[PDB]
Amino acid sequence: MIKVTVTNSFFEVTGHAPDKTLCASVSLLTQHVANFLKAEKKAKIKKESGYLKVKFEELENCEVKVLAAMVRSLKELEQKFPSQIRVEVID
Amino acid sequence: MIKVTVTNSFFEVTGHAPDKTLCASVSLLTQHVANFLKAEKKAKIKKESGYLKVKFEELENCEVKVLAAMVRSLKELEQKFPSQIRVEVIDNGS
Numbered sequence: 001m002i003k004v005t006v007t008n009s010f011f012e013v014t015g016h017a018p019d020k021t022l023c024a025s026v027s028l029l030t031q032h033v034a035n036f037l038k039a040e041k042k043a044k045i046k047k048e049s050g051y052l053k054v055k056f057e058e059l060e061n062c063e064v065k066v067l068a069a070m071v072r073s074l075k076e077l078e079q080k081f082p083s084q085i086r087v088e089v090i091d
Numbered sequence: 092m093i094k095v096t097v098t099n100s101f102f103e104v105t106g107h108a109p110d111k112t113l114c115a116s117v118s119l120l121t122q123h124v125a126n127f128l129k130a131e132k133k134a135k136i137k138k139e140s141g142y143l144k145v146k147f148e149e150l151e152n153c154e155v156k157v158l159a160a161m162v163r164s165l166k167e168l169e170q171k172f173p174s175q176i177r178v179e180v181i182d183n184g185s
Contacts, residue, residue, distance in 0.1 A: 021112045021114075021115040021116075022115070024115065025118075025119045026119075028116045028119070028164075029119055032120065032164055036156075039160070062156070065127065066127065069127035070123065072126055072130070073123040077119070
């Protein structure tokens with residue numbers, strides 16, 4: 001089961017899903033957003049085997065809308081694969 | 092073969108790839124940018140069976156960079172599955 005935790009300070013991706021396409025798809029999207037934030041000096045990344053944690057730094061209007069779209073995108077998947085991915089957005 | 096077209100007015104996605112992981116990665120990444128753009132009213136989405144077309148509207152620095160990043164990533168997948176996906180940026184004028 002893929003676990004995605006998204007807060008105001010960072011987002012975290014752990015675990016794996018039986019579905020290799022769901023698993024490859026989520027790893028691509030999350031790493032994409034992570035690298036986009038890193039590319040513009042807006043985040044520091046921790047990348048290990050089946051683990052990703054992105055720490056936000058100086059987020060502006062642009063990055064906050066990107067993060068929100070990332071949550072949107074993952075929840076649609078959570079709706080379609082409720083037993084393989086779990087999206088928890090904390091306040 | 093997945094065909095991605097990028098112009099100054101829109102980006103389009105058509106066809107499918109034999110590899111299911113490639114199809115899903117592309118569909119998710121492209122719909123993600125499309126969803127991002129629509130949320131802030133910067134794009135209109137035409138979504139069909141094996142067809143996606145996103146028409147831009149008043150793009151600012153933010154989306155230009157998000158879009159450039161989407162292309163960069165698709166060109167990267169193009170490198171990995173050369174027979175399964177084609178990314179065409181149509182540069183017209185002079």
